[PDB]
Amino acid sequence: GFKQDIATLRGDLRTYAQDIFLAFLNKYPDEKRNFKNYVGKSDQELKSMAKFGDHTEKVFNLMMEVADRATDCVPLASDASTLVQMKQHSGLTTGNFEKLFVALVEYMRASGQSFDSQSWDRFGKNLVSALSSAGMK
Numbered sequence: 473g474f475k476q477d478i479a480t481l482r483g484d485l486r487t488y489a490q491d492i493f494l495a496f497l498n499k500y501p502d503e504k505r506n507f508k509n510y511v512g513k514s515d516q517e518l519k520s521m522a523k524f525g526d527h528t529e530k531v532f533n534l535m536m537e538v539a540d541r542a543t544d545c546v547p548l549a550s551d552a553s554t555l556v557q558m559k560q561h562s563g564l565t566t567g568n569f570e571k572l573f574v575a576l577v578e579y580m581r582a583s584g585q586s587f588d589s590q591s592w593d594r595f596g597k598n599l600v601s602a603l604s605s606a607g608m609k
């Protein structure tokens with residue numbers, strides 16, 4: 473289930489962070505307006521850059537902390553606030569997060585593996601809700 477998924481993901485965190493961020497960017501090419509220094513690069517080109525692995529691994533680490541602190545796939549309001557208030561997330565809206573979670577769930581459903589994809593879908597929706605409540609447009 474969800475808790476075991478966090479353990480699976482943490483077990484190979486950089487690899488998964490890469491696979492999932494790429495799934496996101498490839499599903500929603502307009503989303504790359506937020507990531508101007510990854511424009512014009514194929515998946516393997518991105519993976520070859522130490523900065524890409526480093527960024528994706530730090531993002532996924534916080535994502536897993538938030539997931540692990542959630543109750544019944546409902547994240548803490550304080551963690552939502554953190555994500556809203558981060559300087560890095562200034563211009564974002566909840567739709568940016570919705571899209572990330574749609575890509576993440578799709579990635580899980582297509583993997584050979586027993587992820588609890590329905591739990592991740594409900595976590596994404598609840599995270600979107602919490603972001604809105606914490607002041608994201």
Ligand code: HEM
Nearest residue numbers: 503506507526527530531532534535560561564568569572
């Ligand atoms: C639960 C979801 C997310 C988490 C946990 C998260 C976490 C983080 C973290 C930890 C960083 C800093 C990474 C570092 O410099 O070490 C970061 C940067 C950033 N995040 Fe997020 N983020 C999330 C979702 C999003 C989404 C949905 C977007 C846009 C679609 C976004 C856009 C950015 C951007 C633009 C940066 C700065 C990029 C850079 O300077 O290299 N994030 N995020």
Ligand SMILES: COc1ccc(O)c(OC)c1
Nearest residue numbers: 489492493528531532572
């Ligand atoms: C793991 O998923 C990731 C990794 C890096 C990102 O910048 C991101 O933003 C949408 C998601």
